[PDB]
From Swiss-Prot:
It comes from Saccharomyces cerevisiae (strain ATCC 204508 / S288c) (Baker's yeast). Keywords: Electron transport, Heme, Iron, Metal-binding, Methylation, Mitochondrion, Respiratory chain, Transport. This is Cytochrome c isoform 1. Its cofactor is heme c. Present with 7330 molecules/cell in log phase SD medium. Belongs to the cytochrome c family. Electron carrier protein. The oxidized form of the cytochrome c heme group can accept an electron from the heme group of the cytochrome c1 subunit of ubiquinol-cytochrome c oxidoreductase. Cytochrome c then transfers this electron to the dinuclear copper A center (CU(A)) of the COX2 subunit of cytochrome oxidase, the final protein carrier in the mitochondrial electron-transport chain. Isoform 1 (CYC1) is the predominant cytochrome c during aerobic/normoxic growth. Gene3D superfamilies: Cytochrome c-like domain. Induction: By oxygen at the level of transcription. Expression drops rapidly when the oxygen concentration falls below 0.5 uM O(2). The modification N6,N6,N6-trimethyllysine is found at residues 77-78. Binds 1 heme c group covalently per subunit.
Length: 108
């Protein structure tokens, strides 16, 4: 496979128009529909301190890396059969990478 970085930029609005709808990547961030992913990159699937997640996402114990996160976002409901990621997903090629890199910019 090839992740490759690319150029966040669009990734910002993308997040703001895709993920942020349910999420945020902010420090004192709420948990609206989905939990804040502030530095998610580094932990495993089901950390937060409040959210408590689904048994699926938890028991998945999947690591969040630019690579793994990619497939997950490409199609999260398939990757985690039981997440409440009610999400469109990032089955593109560029938009996806722009987002992964954006997240890394927003909080590595
Ligand atoms: C609402 C319609 C959502 C959209 C759009 C996105 N996400 Fe989401 N996400 C949502 C929920 C309700 C949950 C919790 C389910 C669970 O138990 O995991 C999630 C979870 C995630 C996770 C996992 C959290 C963790 O393991 O700590 C990630 C990494 C995640 N979501 C990322 C993510 C991104 C980057 C999105 C835009 C591309 C996105 N989500 C959209 C709900 C919704």
């Amino acid at each position: 496979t090839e992740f490759k970085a690319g150029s966040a930029k669009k990734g910002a609005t993308l997040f703001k128009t895709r993920c942020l709808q349910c999420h945020t990547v902010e420090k004192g961030g709420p948990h609206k529909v989905g939990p804040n992913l502030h530095g998610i990159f580094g932990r495993h699937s089901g950390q937060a301190e409040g959210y408590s997640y689904t048994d699926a996402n938890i028991k998945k114990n999947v690591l969040w890396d630019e690579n793994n996160m990619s497939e997950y976002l490409t199609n999260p409901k398939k990757y985690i059969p039981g997440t409440k990621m009610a999400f469109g997903g990032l089955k593109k090629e560029k938009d996806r990478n722009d987002l992964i890199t954006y997240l890394k910019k927003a909080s590595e």
